[PDB]
Amino acid sequence: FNGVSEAELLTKTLPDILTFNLDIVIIGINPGLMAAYKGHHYPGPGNHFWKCLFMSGLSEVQLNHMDDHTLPGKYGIGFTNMVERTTPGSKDLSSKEFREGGRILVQKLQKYQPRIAVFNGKCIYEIFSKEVFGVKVKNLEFGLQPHKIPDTETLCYVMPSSSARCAQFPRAQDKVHYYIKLKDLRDQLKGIERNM
DNA sequence: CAGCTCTGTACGTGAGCGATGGACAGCT
DNA sequence: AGCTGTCCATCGCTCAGTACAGAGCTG
Numbered sequence A: 001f002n003g004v005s006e007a008e009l010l011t012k013t014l015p016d017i018l019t020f021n022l023d024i025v026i027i028g029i030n031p032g033l034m035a036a037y038k039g040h041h042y043p044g045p046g047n048h049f050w051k052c053l054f055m056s057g058l059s060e061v062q063l064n065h066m067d068d069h070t071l072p073g074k075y076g077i078g079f080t081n082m083v084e085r086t087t088p089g090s091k092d093l094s095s096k097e098f099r100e101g102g103r104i105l106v107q108k109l110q111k112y113q114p115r116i117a118v119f120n121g122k123c124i125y126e127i128f129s130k131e132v133f134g135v136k137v138k139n140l141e142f143g144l145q146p147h148k149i150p151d152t153e154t155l156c157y158v159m160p161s162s163s164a165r166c167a168q169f170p171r172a173q174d175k176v177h178y179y180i181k182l183k184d185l186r187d188q189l190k191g192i193e194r195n196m
Numbered sequence B: 001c002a003g004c005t006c007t008g009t010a011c012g013t014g015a016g017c018g019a020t021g022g023a024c025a026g027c028t
Numbered sequence C: 001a002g003c004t005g006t007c008c009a010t011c012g013c014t015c016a017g018t019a020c021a022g023a024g025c026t027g
Helices: A033-038 A049-055 A065-075 A095-112 A122-132 A176-194
Strands: A024-028 A077-081 A116-120 A155-159
Touching (some): A049 A176, A116 A122, A116 A176, A122 A155, A155 A176
Parallel strands (some): A024 A077, A024 A116
16 A cells, blocks of 8 residues: 555554534444555445445535544534454454454443444444344344444444445445435434424 | 354455556657 | 657456355254
C-alpha cells in the first residue's frame, strides 16, 4: 500500500467516531487493511458502504471515507467496530476477541445511546445476541431485531456486511434496500419523538 | 429421534493491479 | 520510410461474509 507493508498495517487501529445524540452508529467487524492504512471508515474498492449510503439517501451526495468525521454533526451517524485489531479478513479473529469486543461495544452503546445500533454484518450480530441477550437463532434475519441494548432505548438493526466479500449480495445495489429501511426506521423514530 | 452446536464448503460483482501491445509522434 | 520510446487502452486476473449441509452432541 504505497510501500507500506501488511506487517505495519496489522499494528494499526481505527479510531471510533462517536458522540451523544446520534441517530445511528454503524458497527463494523474490525478494520480491514485499507481502513488501517487510511485511518478512515470503509475506504477503497472492496467495500460498498459509501455507495450504499448515497444510493439510499442517507447522504444526499456521494461521500467517501475522508468525510467520516463530518457524519455525526452533519448526518447524525457515528462509527465503531466490534473488534479493534486490523486483519485482512474477519475469519482471522478469535471467538475471545469477538466476545471481548461485544462487552466493550455494549458499554459504548450504553454510554452514547444512539437511536439505532447498526450491525454492519450478520456474523457480528450472531455473536452479539448470544453474548448480550443470551439468545441464539435459528433463524437470524436482517433488519430490526426484537431486543433493545440493555438499560437503553437503543434499537438493533442488522444489514449484510458492506464488504464486497459476500456473494449473496454481490453489488452495492443488492444491499441498498437495508439502508433505505434503516433511513425509514430513523424517520419513524423521529416522527414518534415529535408526537411524544 | 429431535433440536441443537460446531465445522467445512461454495458462492457473484466490479475496482484496480501488473502485463501487453496498439496508436502515435519525434527523430533521422 | 525505418526506427524508437511513451502513453494509455485493454487484458486477465485477484479479491474485499454468508448460507447451508452434515457431523457431533445432548436431552
